[PDB]
Amino acid sequence: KVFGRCELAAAMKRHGLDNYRGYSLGNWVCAAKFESNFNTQATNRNTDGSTDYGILQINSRWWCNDGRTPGSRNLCNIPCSALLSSDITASVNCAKKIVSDGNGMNAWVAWRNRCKGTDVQAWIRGCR
């Protein structure tokens, strides 16, 4: 599923991400834009042998099990493929754990490089 921008904003809001750990909704929408282009099916492999999964590009070294990542920790206790669903519930539940683990949204590299410190509220412009 490729979410619309306001469509994703509404879903993230309904799941309680707006201001979760102090990160406004625009931060989360911006992160998803640059991590996955709003595509729930997005996957990308990394040099360490891990892969990123889904709308928020959750990493298989730390958070989910994909059966092929050395040193995996599976801290969200979930198969990585469940993070590719059209329903964002599992990704949101796991993201809440990730952002609570110490480093806040710095866990998301694209957020750090492209959203952090920018006018993120623009990502929710026009949304109801």
Ligand X SMILES: CC(=O)N[C@H]1[C@H](O[C@H]2[C@H](O)[C@@H](O)CN[C@@H]2CO)O[C@H](CO)[C@@H](O[C@@H]2O[C@H](CO)[C@@H](O[C@@H]3O[C@H](CO)[C@@H](O)[C@H](O)[C@H]3NC(C)=O)[C@H](O)[C@H]2NC(C)=O)[C@@H]1O
Q: Among the residues of 1-128, which ranges form H helices?
A: 5-14, 25-36, 89-99, 109-114
7 is a catalytic site residue: no
Q: Round to whole Å and give the CA distance between 70 and 61.
A: 7
- Tokens for 56? 């928020």
Tell me whether residue 46 or residue 121 sits nearer to ligand X (CB atom): 46
Helix (H) or strand (E) holding 109: helix 109-114
Question: Per rule CB under 6 A, is residue 46 in the interface with ligand X?
Answer: yes
CB 19 within 8 Å of CB 99 = no
Active-site residue 35, yes or no? yes
Among 76, 84, 107, 120, binds ligand X (CB under 6 A): 107
Supply the minimum distance, in Å, between the C-beta of residue 91 and ligand X: 10
61 touches ligand X (CB under 6 A): yes
Range 82-101, binding ligand X (CB under 6 A): 98, 101
Residues that bind ligand X in the complex, under the rule CB under 6 A: 35, 46, 52, 57-59, 61-63, 98, 101-103, 107-110
